[PDB]
Design a protein around this ligand. Sequence first.
Ligand SMILES: CC(C)(COP(=O)(O)OP(=O)(O)OC[C@H]1O[C@@H](n2cnc3c(N)ncnc32)[C@H](O)[C@@H]1OP(=O)(O)O)[C@@H](O)C(=O)NCCC(=O)NCCS
Ligand SMILES: CC(C)(COP(=O)(O)OP(=O)(O)OC[C@H]1O[C@@H](n2cnc3c(N)ncnc32)[C@H](O)[C@@H]1OP(=O)(O)O)[C@@H](O)C(=O)NCCC(=O)NCCS
Ligand SMILES: CC(=O)OP(=O)(O)OC[C@H]1O[C@@H](n2cnc3c(N)ncnc32)[C@H](O)[C@@H]1O
Ligand SMILES: CC(=O)OP(=O)(O)OC[C@H]1O[C@@H](n2cnc3c(N)ncnc32)[C@H](O)[C@@H]1O
Lengths: 562, 562
Amino acid sequence: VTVQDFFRKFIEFQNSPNEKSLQEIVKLVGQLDLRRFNWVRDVFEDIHVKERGSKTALIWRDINTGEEAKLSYHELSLMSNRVLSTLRKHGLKKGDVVYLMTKVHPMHWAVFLAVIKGGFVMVPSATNLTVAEMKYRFSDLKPSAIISDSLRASVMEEALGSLKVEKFLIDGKRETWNSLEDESSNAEPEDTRGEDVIINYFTSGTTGMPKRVIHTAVSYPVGSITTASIVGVRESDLHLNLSATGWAKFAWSSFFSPLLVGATVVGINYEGKLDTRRYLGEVENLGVTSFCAPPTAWRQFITLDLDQFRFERLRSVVSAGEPLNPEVIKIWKDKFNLTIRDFYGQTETTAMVGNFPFLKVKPGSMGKPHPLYDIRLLDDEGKEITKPYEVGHITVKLNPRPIGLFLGYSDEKKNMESFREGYYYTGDKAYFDEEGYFYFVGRGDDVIKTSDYRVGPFEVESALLEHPAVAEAAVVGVPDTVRWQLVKAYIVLKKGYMPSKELAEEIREKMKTLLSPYKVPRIIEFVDELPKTISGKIRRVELRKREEEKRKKGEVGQNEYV
Amino acid sequence: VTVQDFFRKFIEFQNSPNEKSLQEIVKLVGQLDLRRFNWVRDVFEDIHVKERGSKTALIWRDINTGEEAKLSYHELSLMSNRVLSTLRKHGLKKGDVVYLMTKVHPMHWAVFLAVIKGGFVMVPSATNLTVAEMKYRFSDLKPSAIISDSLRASVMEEALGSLKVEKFLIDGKRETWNSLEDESSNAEPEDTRGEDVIINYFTSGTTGMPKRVIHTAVSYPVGSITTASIVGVRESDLHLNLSATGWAKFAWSSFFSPLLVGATVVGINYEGKLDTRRYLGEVENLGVTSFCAPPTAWRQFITLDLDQFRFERLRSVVSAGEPLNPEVIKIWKDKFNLTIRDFYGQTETTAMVGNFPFLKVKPGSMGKPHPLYDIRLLDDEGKEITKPYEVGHITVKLNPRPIGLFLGYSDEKKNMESFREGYYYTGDKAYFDEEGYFYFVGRGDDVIKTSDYRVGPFEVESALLEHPAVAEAAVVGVPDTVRWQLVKAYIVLKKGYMPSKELAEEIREKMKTLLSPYKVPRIIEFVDELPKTISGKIRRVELRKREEEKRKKGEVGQNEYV
Ligand SMILES: CC(C)(COP(=O)(O)OP(=O)(O)OC[C@H]1O[C@@H](n2cnc3c(N)ncnc32)[C@H](O)[C@@H]1OP(=O)(O)O)[C@@H](O)C(=O)NCCC(=O)NCCS
Ligand SMILES: CC(C)(COP(=O)(O)OP(=O)(O)OC[C@H]1O[C@@H](n2cnc3c(N)ncnc32)[C@H](O)[C@@H]1OP(=O)(O)O)[C@@H](O)C(=O)NCCC(=O)NCCS
Ligand SMILES: CC(=O)OP(=O)(O)OC[C@H]1O[C@@H](n2cnc3c(N)ncnc32)[C@H](O)[C@@H]1O
Ligand SMILES: CC(=O)OP(=O)(O)OC[C@H]1O[C@@H](n2cnc3c(N)ncnc32)[C@H](O)[C@@H]1O
């Protein structure tokens, strides 16, 4: 059965989700022939622009400015077509690289479209990212094209240095900043193969510097159905996602999940800190019926006087990126008679397990796996677990290779580490419930996750060695209640340098310069020796055990705490 | 410990080498003040011209022509002085760039002198190099000055069509052909600092087009003692090296090592292919007592009826630039009671490990490292190895940064790759013997070495893409017994072109045009698609695996083999 038939049948299943009907959809995925496939052409245009061309596709609000905008599927399609023209016009061919660094803005959605439509490789780039970070990224994947909002432009320029490349803006600017909107014509689909790459996410890894996860014109564009399945997004729905541009969750709940079902997207852009109340006021005042927010946000929402809210038209509420304490779910349920449904997955994939709408949520459980993923819980030496309450690594079986699973990393050795002989390793660790539920326990990696931002040690460590006074560094995750973890840095000095709170200050402010804010360590401890195995490897694990002991007792040595 | 005292004590140590006396020399080096240092002034003139002025310094023979020559150290100093005058006279200053492309000829050695004496930066250029390649070189580093023999005048001219720069010859031709023999006077040493650059070698890289390694008026001229200690060369010696002009091995064993000890140099010039027998005939017929030859030559020498030679006054025989097969050493030893002592190094360095004369040779082994270099065998994650039979990368420690070690490359990123955190990477891989011997296993690079010529893929791949019929190319080294590896080229055709031994021929002839002989592929295999990672990287690894399996089973499959 045809591409278009598939998606419509899914949409109907969304309007009343049920396990049987899910099993049906699962088989139908098995039948799809995706060998040459362009999502914009085949689904956006062919279904939604056809059948919903005049339906309002996106509603956008800048909290800071007040600026409002609303675009219909048609208006939107022509916008995307203009950009695709303007890209080809400034000399871009399929497979060419496009960095995208913008605020939440209608033109962000236009550019996502252009890129899928034109079969280009886009690199979503956060707006936190520092010139340093951008120069690394370019060094890894050199850019054919650059697109930025006015405020993030100065950073991109400086990072490029000598590189000459196409430079585009969403606003109006002084020099080599041409607007994307020019020609509707020349909006011809690229015939892209399903297995063609269109997106490169720069994801943080344990061992080293962040590399790229590689997503095809089928992996995300259709795999995202797993996500939608768990959230319960329908055609009627107004959908809202609290995610930053430059990351997957954006692609998941802000872009693909709503637009698959022809829903109305709601995009709220703010600079700086989350006005927790003002935000929820917009939610209520725009009548959003489907809402996904990272746990860190939910944590902030609870602390408010919630009596001032009557979330009148709110139907679906979800969470993903970090653990969600039952206590939070309870308070929200108590105040509004809605449950927040925790779901799981990685930049590397789409939604993997979760509390579907028709599933009795178990608090703090993420829930049950999606049947399209072949989810296995392996012990050491890859024996999949039966015993419910026993802990192990979380893995995808590749034998039937799930769609949604990224083609693989940019760094073939991390490919060899992660992919093990019929299994992909997420590295994360969990246990089964008798009833086949899933409770996240933590990360096998040395990976840190603060405020839904995944940070890998080496990024910060190497940043630290940039200071004259630093001979060795070790970056670890510390428990925090608000953001799930915090960044701690153990440091060993050169001769001459003495350990001082004044010095810790100095180093940290240098790091502000180099690292994205979420990455600047909130704690700096000067030490003598770092724990090492014989090999010479740093036992960061051992540092965290040390920190568990310290926190049971209330210890602090010469740690500086900011 | 004065400069001159040092070298005379070194010469004595050469007359009977021993580990004790070596360790002593090592300390004495530590004491030298070479902060301003000119090799010709301080060593050539001061020691040899003074005390060996009338000693025959060089004997030169052209096999083909029959032309014979003999020059004393004085005659030679006068020669160098003439040219240096003539260079200054035509407007050359210290730090000026001088390309040198000649056949083995006394004036080659005169010009080497002039250059070091005048503090000029020379680019030794083999006489193979194509007009194409020379245009590359000039593009990278502009020439002040050019010196060529009669025959390759043509080629330089065409590459130098570009500009007017000072142009000089070893013979007598019509246009911009100034002899360097004009004036002895103005032969005044340039006050060169130890760390001043005098030699720039264009060396082939794995990833890309060749860059330049940078050598000072101390690195080679005195680091060359590593080399000379290893090949036990003496004052009394008649020394011969089989190397092509325009590469390191020449500077090492043909120029610096002999002239350090005030030996008698022997230069044999031949055009085209090595008359394996006729060459050795000249060796015996001249009474060479110390001889160095690349392994590829030794391999050719074995195949002879060796009974027809009685190598009467031959004392030292040595090898370098490739592995030396035990079989070869054995056959030569059996026939002549001489061992061929395999030593090692890079254009980047001087001799680093070798079979010193006082060392019991282990077949296949390079031998033991030279004490001037801190040689380390690091595993992945740079943990120096203890376990003897364990393969790792070969690295120099920079802690005290050994002299002889090139300042660095012309390209800062290859500098960042190679020089890693207290260590320079040769990239080469080897293992220890219990007793601290060293057995080269291969290159970590995708680098090829044929007949002691170090060839880099990208040069040749790009050269191939120049052909109309070539869509994709991939260059790999295949085993050969005579040359250590051979150049194989995997090609993906454009549509229309049909694979044929005749098409392979056509491409080969075009490559003769663009690339130096050692770089023309000896094999062309037309294939459909090449194996690649997700990234788009060509898995050369995978190519060689394929070829070793094909050769174990004895198969081919539309490869054309010249
Ligand atoms: C969950 C979330 C809303 C938390 O609310 P928040 O407190 O406003 O968010 P953050 O702490 O991350 O960032 C705001 C804070 O950092 C500062 N900040 C961060 N980046 C900044 C930037 N580029 N410019 C200015 N300030 C910045 C803000 O001023 C504020 O300061 P504070 O730390 O003293 O509060 C927010 O972190 C978020 O959206 N997370 C990212 C979700 C995501 O897509 N991650 C990847 C998953 S695939
Ligand atoms: C090792 C060596 C002596 C082997 O001798 P050889 O086998 O006669 O040499 P080669 O095969 O490389 O070159 C001779 C062949 O190439 C051709 N050739 C190579 N360069 C040539 C040139 N500049 N002009 C003419 N012919 C040339 C010859 O005609 C001959 O072809 P043939 O074998 O079909 O008759 C030779 O490779 C050599 O001198 N190598 C240099 C070592 C060196 O300096 N290393 C560089 C890095 S340190
Ligand atoms: C979309 C996204 O988050 O991708 P990314 O930023 O790459 O993070 C990936 C890591 O997030 C953690 N994670 C995600 N969902 C979670 C959940 N429901 N409960 C607990 N942990 C969760 C895991 O540890 C993953 O490995
Ligand atoms: C002087 C010269 O030849 O330098 P150069 O042309 O730059 O090449 C350097 C490369 O030659 C190889 N090499 C040199 N000596 C060797 C030996 N004894 N055994 C095995 N391999 C050897 C290595 O692989 C080097 O990395």
